[PDB]
Every structure is written in C-alpha cells, then in structure tokens.
Design a protein around this motif. Structure first.
Motif, PDB file in Angstrom:
ATOM      1  N   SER A   1     138.339  29.296 186.799  1.00 41.20           N
ATOM      2  CA  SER A   1     137.050  28.897 187.355  1.00 41.20           C
ATOM      3  C   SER A   1     136.364  30.065 188.048  1.00 41.20           C
ATOM      4  N   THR A   2     137.101  30.808 188.879  1.00 37.70           N
ATOM      5  CA  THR A   2     136.470  31.929 189.571  1.00 37.70           C
ATOM      6  C   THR A   2     136.112  33.050 188.598  1.00 37.70           C
ATOM      7  N   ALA A   3     136.974  33.313 187.606  1.00 37.52           N
ATOM      8  CA  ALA A   3     136.668  34.356 186.633  1.00 37.52           C
ATOM      9  C   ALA A   3     135.467  33.990 185.772  1.00 37.52           C
ATOM     10  N   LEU A   4     135.258  32.697 185.517  1.00 41.01           N
ATOM     11  CA  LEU A   4     134.103  32.262 184.743  1.00 41.01           C
ATOM     12  C   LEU A   4     132.833  32.242 185.582  1.00 41.01           C
ATOM     13  N   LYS A   5     132.947  31.908 186.870  1.00 38.92           N
ATOM     14  CA  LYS A   5     131.782  31.937 187.747  1.00 38.92           C
ATOM     15  C   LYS A   5     131.308  33.361 188.001  1.00 38.92           C
ATOM     16  N   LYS A   6     132.232  34.327 188.031  1.00 36.14           N
ATOM     17  CA  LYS A   6     131.851  35.702 188.338  1.00 36.14           C
ATOM     18  C   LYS A   6     130.921  36.309 187.290  1.00 36.14           C
ATOM     19  N   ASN A   7     130.923  35.793 186.063  1.00 31.69           N
ATOM     20  CA  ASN A   7     130.173  36.377 184.951  1.00 31.69           C
ATOM     21  C   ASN A   7     129.281  35.332 184.290  1.00 31.69           C
ATOM     22  N   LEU A   8     128.517  34.595 185.099  1.00 31.47           N
ATOM     23  CA  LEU A   8     127.716  33.498 184.563  1.00 31.47           C
ATOM     24  C   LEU A   8     126.545  34.009 183.727  1.00 31.47           C
ATOM     25  N   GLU A   9     125.827  35.020 184.226  1.00 33.12           N
ATOM     26  CA  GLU A   9     124.596  35.453 183.567  1.00 33.12           C
ATOM     27  C   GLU A   9     124.859  36.073 182.199  1.00 33.12           C
ATOM     28  N   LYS A  10     126.013  36.721 182.023  1.00 38.07           N
ATOM     29  CA  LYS A  10     126.351  37.283 180.720  1.00 38.07           C
ATOM     30  C   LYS A  10     126.538  36.191 179.676  1.00 38.07           C
ATOM     31  N   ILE A  11     127.031  35.018 180.090  1.00 35.96           N
ATOM     32  CA  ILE A  11     127.159  33.883 179.177  1.00 35.96           C
ATOM     33  C   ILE A  11     125.873  33.081 179.076  1.00 35.96           C
ATOM     34  N   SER A  12     124.760  33.600 179.593  1.00 36.00           N
ATOM     35  CA  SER A  12     123.454  32.993 179.377  1.00 36.00           C
ATOM     36  C   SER A  12     122.471  33.905 178.660  1.00 36.00           C
ATOM     37  N   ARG A  13     122.595  35.223 178.817  1.00 35.01           N
ATOM     38  CA  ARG A  13     121.630  36.129 178.203  1.00 35.01           C
ATOM     39  C   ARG A  13     121.845  36.272 176.698  1.00 35.01           C
ATOM     40  N   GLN A  14     122.997  36.805 176.291  1.00 35.43           N
ATOM     41  CA  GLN A  14     123.343  36.997 174.880  1.00 35.43           C
ATOM     42  C   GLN A  14     124.611  36.234 174.505  1.00 35.43           C
ATOM     43  N   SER A  15     124.734  35.004 175.001  1.00 33.65           N
ATOM     44  CA  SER A  15     126.019  34.407 175.353  1.00 33.65           C
ATOM     45  C   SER A  15     127.135  34.577 174.329  1.00 33.65           C
TER      46      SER A  15
ATOM     47  N   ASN B   1     134.200  22.349 192.181  1.00 33.51           N
ATOM     48  CA  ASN B   1     133.183  21.361 192.516  1.00 33.51           C
ATOM     49  C   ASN B   1     132.470  20.912 191.241  1.00 33.51           C
ATOM     50  N   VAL B   2     131.405  20.122 191.397  1.00 33.84           N
ATOM     51  CA  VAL B   2     130.691  19.597 190.239  1.00 33.84           C
ATOM     52  C   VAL B   2     129.951  20.693 189.482  1.00 33.84           C
ATOM     53  N   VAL B   3     129.686  21.828 190.121  1.00 36.37           N
ATOM     54  CA  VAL B   3     128.919  22.898 189.490  1.00 36.37           C
ATOM     55  C   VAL B   3     129.830  23.927 188.834  1.00 36.37           C
ATOM     56  N   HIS B   4     130.862  24.379 189.545  1.00 36.57           N
ATOM     57  CA  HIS B   4     131.703  25.474 189.084  1.00 36.57           C
ATOM     58  C   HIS B   4     132.961  25.011 188.361  1.00 36.57           C
ATOM     59  N   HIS B   5     133.114  23.713 188.122  1.00 36.64           N
ATOM     60  CA  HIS B   5     134.270  23.238 187.376  1.00 36.64           C
ATOM     61  C   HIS B   5     134.179  23.709 185.925  1.00 36.64           C
ATOM     62  N   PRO B   6     135.288  24.171 185.340  1.00 35.50           N
ATOM     63  CA  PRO B   6     135.247  24.626 183.941  1.00 35.50           C
ATOM     64  C   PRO B   6     134.886  23.533 182.947  1.00 35.50           C
ATOM     65  N   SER B   7     134.933  22.260 183.345  1.00 37.82           N
ATOM     66  CA  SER B   7     134.555  21.183 182.436  1.00 37.82           C
ATOM     67  C   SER B   7     133.043  20.999 182.382  1.00 37.82           C
ATOM     68  N   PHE B   8     132.369  21.097 183.526  1.00 35.84           N
ATOM     69  CA  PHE B   8     130.921  20.941 183.588  1.00 35.84           C
ATOM     70  C   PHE B   8     130.167  22.207 183.205  1.00 35.84           C
ATOM     71  N   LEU B   9     130.878  23.278 182.838  1.00 33.20           N
ATOM     72  CA  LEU B   9     130.255  24.571 182.568  1.00 33.20           C
ATOM     73  C   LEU B   9     129.044  24.437 181.654  1.00 33.20           C
ATOM     74  N   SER B  10     129.249  23.850 180.471  1.00 36.69           N
ATOM     75  CA  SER B  10     128.157  23.671 179.518  1.00 36.69           C
ATOM     76  C   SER B  10     126.950  23.019 180.179  1.00 36.69           C
ATOM     77  N   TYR B  11     127.182  21.922 180.906  1.00 36.31           N
ATOM     78  CA  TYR B  11     126.097  21.250 181.612  1.00 36.31           C
ATOM     79  C   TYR B  11     125.333  22.229 182.492  1.00 36.31           C
ATOM     80  N   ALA B  12     126.062  23.007 183.300  1.00 35.05           N
ATOM     81  CA  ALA B  12     125.417  24.005 184.147  1.00 35.05           C
ATOM     82  C   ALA B  12     124.562  24.954 183.321  1.00 35.05           C
ATOM     83  N   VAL B  13     125.086  25.415 182.181  1.00 35.22           N
ATOM     84  CA  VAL B  13     124.302  26.288 181.313  1.00 35.22           C
ATOM     85  C   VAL B  13     123.045  25.569 180.845  1.00 35.22           C
TER      86      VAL B  13
END
Lengths: 106, 172, 102, 90, 312, 330
Positions: A66-80, F289-301
C-alpha cells in the motif's frame, strides 16, 4: 530477464524454508485413549499459532504494498500501463457482480 | 537394508514417488497416468516388486510410498505383508499410503475388505479405493496421488506430511 | 521412452525373459488342449511328519491353446523363472499323460 | 541488490540443512511389527507434534525489505489473475 | 417403528467389527413329516440361485387360483397371437405344491414349489423352489402383510424362469436378483464341508482354478482322495467343534505349497471357481448341487444368510 | 400418507434399483451411463417435492461413498447428499464426513466449491426442518449438532484456504455460506450465533477484491443486527455466551480501525512500529483506509482524472459498505 531469476529465487527460498523447518523438527524430536487428547490439543495449538503468523505476514505485506503504491500515484496516472485497462475491466465487473448479488438476495 | 526418509538432501524442485506391487502392467499404467499431465514440479516415478530394493547410491531420496494391494489374489497381500517389515517407523508419519484395487467386482474378490481396513488402521495410514483397469478412474486417482506427493515433498508452504497425517485421520 | 520412469528389478526381468526364451525356444508351439498328471508322492512340509503313506492326486491342465499359455506364465509373474521339467517336456518326450511316484 | 541477499540466505539455509542432516544421520533404524506398531506410532506422533509446536512458536516474520518495482510487478500479476477470477465469479 | 429398526441394522453393517467363527455342521435326523419322495427328487440336480424381496399379500389358502392364473398367463405368452381363456385345459399345467419339514425354526414360513407339467402323470419341465432357513434377522424388520422367502432356486430352462419371475414381480411386487458366490465363501465352504464326518465317501474332493492370463486362457483342476484331505484337515485342526479363519488359511496353504513344490506355479495368484466334495458342489456363478440328505439344512441356512446379506 | 407397507415396498424397490443400476458399485458396467443420470435427476426432482428424502438414497450413500472417485455423477450425488435427515453430528460424521473430507483435501478447487454448496444446502434444509418443531432430544441437544457442523465446515474452509494459496474463487463460496449462517436467529427464530474463525475474517479484510469487502461489510452488519435483536429478547427469555460478544466487538474495532479511524493496530494486527521504522513505513495510520487501500486503487484512479467522493463509491454499487457506515455512525 531478471524477473525469471527473481521468481526462481523466491520459489527456492520458499521451498528451502519449509524443508529446513521439517529437518529441524525431526532433529529436535530425535533427542491409548489418553493420548489422542494430547495429540488433538497439540495440533490445535499448532493451528492457532500458524493462523496468527500467517495473518501478521499478510498484514505486513499488504501495508508495504500500500505505501509503495501510494508513493508513486502520479506515474500510474500519466502514462500508466495496460494496468489501466485491467482496472477498467475490474470496475466493469464489480458492479455487475454486486447487482447479481442483490438479485439473489431478493 | 532399511529405507530411511531423510538419508539424502532434496533436489531443486523435484518430487519422487515409489510404487510397490506385484502387477507390473497396472503400475506402468498408473505411472503413465501420473506423468501424462503437466505440473509446476519435476516428477519422478520408481517401480518395484517388493522390499528391500537392490542396493544403490544413485537413487535420490523418496518422498512417498504407495502399497498397491490387489483384492483378487492373496499373493499380493502376502508380498505387501512381507515388504512392510523393511521400512523404519519414521516413514509411517504421513508418507505411506495403501491403494486397494478390485473392490468393484465383488464376485472376483478373494480377500475381505475388513482385512485391508484393519491393516491400514494398524499402521496409521490412509486407504484408497480404485479400479486401475478403467482409465477414467485411474486418471483421477493419479491426479490425487500427484497432489499428495506435492504436499509431502514440501512444495506447499504451511502444510507438511505431519499435518496431512492429521487431515486424513479417521474417527473410528 | 519416458525417461522419467525408472524401472527397478530390470535385471530380474531380463533374466526371466532369457530363461523363458531358452526353455520354450523360438519356434511356433504345436497346438494342444489337454494334459494330465497323476501324483503318488509324499507330503513334505510339523504337518503330517509321521505319515508314511503317499498323497494320491490327479491334476488336469486344460486350455484352448496349450503350450502358449504356459510360456506366458513366468513373464506375467504367476510362476518362477525356470518352470518344472514336467511342463516343458511335452513335445520333446512325445507324452501327454504322466505318472509320478516318490 | 536484494538478489545477493537472497542468494546468501539460501546458501546459509543449505549449510544449516546439511549440518542438520549430518547430525540426524547418526540414529539407528527402528522397524515395527504387527503387534507393537500402533502404540509406537502414537508415541512418535506425540513427540513429533511436541517438537513442531516449539519449532513453529520460534518462528518470527522476516523483514528482509525489498525494492518497490518488485512489489509493483507482483501487484500487476495479482490484478491480472483477479480479472479472470472475477469473470468466472460473474 | 420397523423402519427405524431396519435403518439401524442397515447402518450397523460396517467393516470395523471382526467377523465371527462358524460351528462345524452336525448331521441331524430330518423331521418325519417330510415326504421322502420329494427329498429324493430335490437331490442330485443343479439349481440356479436367486435372492428375492418379501412378497406383498401372499396367502397360503388360495393356491389353486394362483396356479390357474399362471397357467393361463404362460399359455397366452407362448402363442403371442391369439387369446386364451382362464378355465381352459391346455397341453401344459402349473401345479402349486407345499413342502414340509424344510424350515429352520418355527418362526420361519413354509416352503412351496411351482412345477410345470406336460401331460400326455406327465413330465416335469421346470421347477421353482422358494425357501427361507434361519431368517430371524429379516423377520423382525418386516410387517405382517409380507412373507419373507429370500432364497429362490430354479431348475429348467431360462425362458420359463423369465416368465415366472415376470409374473411374480407383476403380481406380488417383488424383485429377483442373481446370487453369486466369491472365492472367499467358496474357500470357507470347502473347509466347512471337509470338517464334516461321513460314513462313506462317494466322490473325491475337487477344486477348479482359473489362471488370469487374459491374452491366453488356462484352467487347472485339483482332485484328491477324501481320506487324504480329511487327514490333512485333522493335522491342522486344533479348535474343538469350531472353524477359524487361520485354520482355513493353513488348509489352503498346505495345498498351495504341495502344488508349488511340484509345478513351481503360484496357485495363490489364481481365482477359485468351483468346489466339489462328497456332500455338495458349488460354482462361483451361483449353482449348487446337493448330494447328502443329512446336511441339507446347513447348506440351506448358509445360502439363506448369503441372500439376506445381499438383500440388506 | 405415512403408511408402513407403502414405505417398505418403495424402499425395497428403490434400494434394489439403485444397487443394480450403479456404475461403480458391485459391478463394472459403464453401459448404463446417461440412464443412471436421468434416474438420479428424476429422484432429485421428486424429492425436491415432499420436502424430504427417502431412506433408500441414504443407504445407497452410506454404501457407495467409500468407493466413489468424485467425478462420475458429482452433481446428482452432491444434490442427493443435501437431502439427509436431521441427526446427531457424532453419529453421522464417521459414515459421511470422514470420506467427504478425505476426498475434499485431495481434489481440485471445483470439487471444493461443489461440496461447499452442498453443505450450505444441507444446513438450510436442516434449519428449515428444525424451525417448525419449536411450534409443536430437546432443542439444547439439537443446537449442538448444527454448532458442530458449522465449526467443522469452518475448519474445512480454513484448511482449504491454506491449501489453495488464498484463491478468491473459494473465498466467494465461503462468504456465501457464512451469509446464510449469519442470519439464523432472524430467519428461523432459533437462538444461535456462531462467528467465522479469525483466519477467514483477516483473509477477507486484506484482499484485493472489492466485492469481498462489500460482502464482509454486509455480513458484519447482519451480525450486529442479529446480536442486538437477540440481546433485547434475552431479557424477556430470562443463555448467550458473553465471550462471543466481546470477540465480535474486537472484529468490529479492527474493521473501523482500517476504515476511517486510522487505528489499524487492534488485537489482531499486533505489529509493533519498529518493523515499520526499519522497513521505511512513515505514514502507516492511514495506509489501509478507503483511499489508499490496494483494493480501491482503481476507484481512486477513476476519481483522479476527474474530496467528498464517498457518494461516488456508493453510486458505483457499494451498497454493503454504505449500510455498514450508516449502521456504525448512527
């Protein structure tokens, strides 16, 4: 190329841990109605500790991901990725699944 | 010689099974049915008539032993009873199985089912039933044996042979 | 041919095959359908040790094609590698009915 | 990199397993009969379960922190399988 | 309720309990109420065995009407084209007779025979025998509207047996099933019949074995004098008045070793097919031939218990 | 009718027919094939009516189960298993459940799902037949049997989840079974509340699937409803074990500890922060949480390309989460 070696090393370590545990247990152990109760108590204790260990490991791995995926959010939105196609497919499937669940409930 | 479970070190993603019986054609068909599919591990099958085996060092360690008992002949029962005296007790901790063949045709059976039931209960081991002459049942039995071998070989994290001993335990 | 399968006791299999080939030959066996043996030998096995009288027995072998089912007994695992001389001397001795005494 | 760490860990585990096998190879064989098999096997099961209980209690979750790209790829594969899982469920 | 008792005795048949031993069959003087001519007629013929479910609403009072209806049915089945009256006299006749002195206990039902006779008395062409000997395990779980006769024996052509069975199933709502005997029961019968005492031996003791060589075919016969077999049995018999599984195993191993010492053939890997002795002869397909009139009740009770085990 | 001669005649006929027509019992005759399947389908369609099963089918099941392979007539066989009369678990275990478990622990995942469906149907039938007897062994000895059955199937589910390497296709069936389990006291008016083991709960809470989270929220809401409905009626009856209550509370805590409370370290996830610090996790309070959970990821995107987005999640179809939030906040 490196992913093959990574997966091979992960599988080798996962098998080696399980084999070394059995080896150590056998070496440690090397050194009628009233016996089945003790046997079932021991196996229940083993199950109870194994469940807790697995839960802790899974929680730690999930937090790390979860933390490793949150750290790089914008890269998975620009050219994901094609991951965006996977996400849109999952989003399309979940709604239909939930609707079918509600219909089955009724 | 006496066979011991942990005499040698394991290989790299390799599982080995041993089949002991009197009918060689049934053992060959069972080995073919076991190896006809594809799995994640590297499977090896050894065939034998009785115990002990001819002396050799090149033989890798054995992970599972299956005793095939044909209910249509007392010769196979005597052979299994004789072979059961050349394995150490440490091998009976979830690494030995019994497979009875011929229970479908009751008119041909020369051995009562109570005999093999008591034999399996005495040594604390599971008992399986299958007619090896039919391919449809033989395929399913081969798949089940492959899964049991993968469990006993240590390729499933969290489950060992000692746990499989408790999973397949009978109430009475 | 499926090198993953390891056939043990292969030396015993080749030995019994060689013994069968040497005993029964390689020529086509003549077609017979019956054989008869009479036995007047003593029982030797505690059990009937004091008995001094023979055991009278009469045995009959019947088959649609004799001398061909016997040849396949040793490789199938129903008999030993060398068969008894009473069963492998039918065409050589020109005899079909046998009498054996102690 | 973490690959060298994994290789060294596997080497240490293999050395420990070799020492364990060398220590275990000094025990004599014990064969059973038809009369003294059930009780002996029950006693051996008790001993083995008592050993395995402590062996599992001594286990702790290993940290061995990895990088982030491996986690990204693992998540990618997990989602890729979850796709077909969801379609079958539907 | 009887249904609960039936379910209880059904689910009780598990493979955990050790099978019991058997008593040596003792010769007994038959009751004097039985017809000796019928006993002489029942011997020396080969019978085919069947198991039968209880008959619904069977009355022993009206046996003539049953015979008349069965005769009319058989005659109408013979000529598939034309009609047949009931009270007409045809070339064949069906006779329902009652047997006596064939029951084991006073609680067992009476046996009876159904015979087909060609008039020209006439010639008997087919014989059916319904019997139940020592069937107390079955009589308890059945109501009073039924009649328990689990053992059926047929002598004649199968074309008439089929018609008789069809008529019985359509009339009394029963079920006929073929009864087979495996090598285990044959090996038990051999020892139980050898352990019996006889005054004179009329036939030698013979066993038949079928060697599994499926590409080829081969059968083996083993004949031995009755006195030698009796001596071999007495050499291994040590339990007074009872037969144990270990004794049967030793009695068979003696013959196995005697055969292997001469022919080097493992007779333990074959299949026992037929066993004949001086009291009776049995085949694995479900055929029995009785020779001695003193040990009739024992064989009948064995076959009745086999049929009861098959139907339950 | 409930007549003895008719029942005896039907029992004898059906038992003989099933014994003679079987494919793997007492004879090797595959020539029947589809005939036996059609006969079993007719029997199942007949026993769906009359709301009960015959004794001949139970006897045939007890006889032919040890010889079954698990693939010949799986559907019809497992449908016949569901129509078993109510009896004590200790007596019916060695005849059926031992062989069922031995065939379950060595088969594929589809066999596991099929036997889970069969066990769910069996539990439903047992509850339906027990709900009518209270309107007429007492109930105390009757609830113990269903409690032991629920514990047995929970142990089966835990072992299967450990074996199949945490496959969601099996977790779906497990949650489907526990959905029927959680509403017993409300549906059938029988006092009984049994919770799932912590393994299943913590495997469903930490999954990547969103439908799993939705079903978990719905199950927790139904559990809370049943508990608060039974607690007020216990005062009229006066006993529910207090322990269970506390246990339930713990679960609930953990749940909110990950949803919006930012306190994920409850009694279950007892991970001390030194591992988080040597690993490099600085913000762990709101990691799941509801935002940073790896399951809701797509939704957040899906919300990143377009702040007060809970309505978006509710419109996407997350009804169970909405019900859980509305029942927990209020």
């Amino acid at each position: 190329c490196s992913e093959d070696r990574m997966t091979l090393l992960l599988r080798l370590r996962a098998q080696t841990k399980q084999q070394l545990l059995e080896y150590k247990s056998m070496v440690d152990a090397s050194e009628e109605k009233q016996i089945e109760a003790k046997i079932e108590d021991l196996e229940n204790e083993i199950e109870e500790v194994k469940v807790a260990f697995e839960i802790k490991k899974l929680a730690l791995d999930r937090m790390r991901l979860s933390t490793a995926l949150k750290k790089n959010l914008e890269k998975i939105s620009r050219q994901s990725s094609v991951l965006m196609d996977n996400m849109k497919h999952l989003l399309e499937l979940n709604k239909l699944i939930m609707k079918s669940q509600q219909e089955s409930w009724d | 010689s006496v066979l011991r479970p942990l005499d040698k070190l394991p290989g790299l993603n390799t599982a080995t099974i041993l089949l002991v019986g009197t009918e060689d054609a049934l053992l060959q068909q069972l080995a073919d049915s076991m190896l006809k599919e594809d799995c994640a591990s590297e499977l090896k099958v050894h065939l034998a008539k009785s115990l002990p085996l001819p002396s050799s060092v090149n033989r890798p360690r054995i992970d599972l032993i299956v005793f095939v008992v044909n209910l249509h002949s007392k010769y196979s029962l005597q052979n299994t009873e004789e072979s059961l005296r050349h394995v150490d007790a440490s091998f009976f901790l979830g690494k030995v199985c019994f497979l009875a063949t011929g229970a479908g045709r009751e008119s041909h059976c020369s051995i009562h089912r109570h005999t093999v039931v008591k034999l399996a209960h005495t040594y604390q081991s599971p008992l399986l039933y299958c007619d090896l002459e039919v391919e449809g049942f033989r395929a399913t039995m081969a798949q089940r044996l492959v899964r049991v071998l993968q469990i006993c070989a240590g390729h499933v994290p969290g489950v060992s042979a000692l746990n499989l001993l408790s999973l397949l335990r009978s109430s009475e | 041919m499926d090198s993953r399968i390891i056939h043990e006791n292969i030396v015993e299999k080749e030995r019994v095959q060689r013994i069968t080939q040497e005993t029964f030959g390689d020529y086509p066996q003549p077609q017979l359908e019956f054989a008869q043996y009479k036995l007047e030998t003593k029982f030797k096995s505690s059990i009937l040790a004091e008995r001094e009288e023979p055991l009278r027995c009469l045995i009959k072998f019947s088959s649609p094609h004799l001398l061909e089912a016997l040849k396949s007994l040793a490789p199938a695992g129903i008999a030993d590698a060398p068969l008894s001389p009473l069963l492998t001397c039918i065409p050589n001795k020109r005899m079909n009915y046998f009498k054996i005494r102690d | 990199n973490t690959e060298e760490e994994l290789i060294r860990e596997c080497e240490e585990m293999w050395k420990d397993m070799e020492e364990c096998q060398n220590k275990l190879s000094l025990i004599g064989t014990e064969t059973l009969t038809d009369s003294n098999a059930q009780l002996s096997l029950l006693i051996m099961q008790v001993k083995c379960l008592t050993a395995e209980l402590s062996q599992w209690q001594k286990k702790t979750p290993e940290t061995i922190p990895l990088t982030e790209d491996v986690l990204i790829t693992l998540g990618k594969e997990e989602f890729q399988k979850l796709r077909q899982d969801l379609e079958m469920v539907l | 309720p009887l249904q609960k008792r039936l379910e209880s005795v059904r689910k009780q048949s598990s493979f955990i309990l050790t099978p019991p031993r058997r008593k040596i069959p003792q010769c007994s003087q038959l009751q004097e109420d039985v017809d000796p001519q019928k006993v002489a007629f029942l011997l020396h013929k080969q019978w085919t065995l069947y198991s039968l479910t209880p008959l619904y609403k069977f009355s022993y009072s009206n046996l003539k009407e049953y015979s008349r209806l069965l005769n009319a049915f058989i005659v109408a089945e013979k000529q598939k084209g034309l009609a047949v009256e009931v009270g007409e006299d045809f070339n064949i006749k069906v006779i329902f007779s009652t047997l006596l002195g064939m029951k084991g206990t006073q609680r067992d039902p009476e046996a009876f025979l159904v015979q087909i006779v060609s008039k020209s008395e006439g010639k008997v062409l087919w014989t059916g025998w319904f019997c139940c000997v020592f069937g107390d395990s079955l009589l308890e779980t059945v109501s009073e509207d039924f009649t328990c006769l689990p053992l059926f024996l047929a002598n004649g052509a199968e074309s008439n047996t089929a018609i008789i069975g069809t008529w019985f199933q359509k009339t009394f709502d029963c079920y006929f099933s073929p009864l087979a005997i495996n090598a285990f029961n044959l090996s038990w019968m051999a020892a139980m019949w050898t352990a019996c005492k006889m005054d004179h031996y009329v036939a030698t003791t013979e066993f038949l074995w079928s060697v599994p060589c499926s590409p080829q075919s081969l059968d083996i016969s083993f004949a031995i004098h009755p006195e030698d077999a009796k001596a071999l049995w007495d050499s291994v018999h040590k339990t007074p008045g009872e037969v144990t599984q270990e004794e049967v195993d030793l009695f068979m191993d003696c013959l196995y070793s005697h055969f292997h010492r001469h022919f080097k053939i493992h007779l333990s890997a074959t299949r026992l097919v037929r066993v004949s002795t001086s009291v009776a002869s049995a085949h694995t397909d479900g055929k029995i031939k009785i020779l001695c009139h003193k040990y009739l009740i024992g064989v009948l009770a064995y076959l009745t218990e086999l049929a009861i085990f098959q139907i339950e | 009718v409930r007549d003895e001669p008719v029942l005896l005649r039907f029992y004898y006929w059906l038992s003989q027919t099933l014994q003679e027509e079987c494919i793997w019992y007492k004879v090797n005759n595959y020539e029947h094939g589809k005939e036996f399947t059609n006969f079993l389908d007719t029997i199942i369609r007949a026993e769906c009516f009359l709301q009960e099963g015959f004794y001949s089918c139970e006897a045939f099941l007890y006889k032919s189960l040890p010889l079954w392979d698990g693939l010949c007539c799986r559907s019809q066989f497992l449908q016949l298993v569901s129509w078993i009369p109510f009896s004590s678990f200790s007596e019916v275990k060695p005849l059926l459940f031992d062989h069922l478990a031995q065939l379950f622990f060595t088969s594929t995942i589809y066999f596991k799902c099929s036997v889970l469906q069969s066990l769910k149907e069996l539990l439903q039938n047992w509850l339906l037949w027990l709900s009518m007897d209270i309107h007429m062994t007492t109930l105390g000895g009757s609830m113990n049997s269903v409690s032991k059955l629920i514990h047995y199937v929970g142990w089966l589910s835990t072992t299967a989840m450990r074996l199949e390497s945490n496959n969601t296709f099996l977790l779906h069936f497990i949650l489907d079974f526990y959905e029927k389990v959680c509403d017993i006291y409300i549906n059938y008016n029988l006092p009984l509340v049994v919770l799932f083991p912590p393994g299943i709960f913590y495997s469903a809470l930490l999954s990547l699937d969103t439908s799993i989270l939705n079903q978990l929220c719905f199950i927790m809401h139904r559990y809370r409803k049943n508990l608060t409905a039974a607690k007020k009626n216990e005062l009229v009856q006066k006993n529910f074990s207090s322990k269970t209550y506390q246990e339930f509370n713990h679960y609930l805590t953990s749940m909110v500890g990950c949803l919006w409370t930012s306190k994920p370290f409850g009694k279950g996830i007892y991970i001390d922060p030194e591992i988080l610090e040597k690993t490099g996790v600085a913000e762990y309070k709101n990691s799941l949480n509801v935002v940073h959970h790896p399951s809701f990821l797509s939704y957040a995107v899906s919300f990143l390309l377009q702040s007060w987005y809970l309505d978006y999640l509710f419109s996407q179809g997350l009804q169970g989460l909405k019900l859980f939030i509305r029942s927990s906040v209020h």
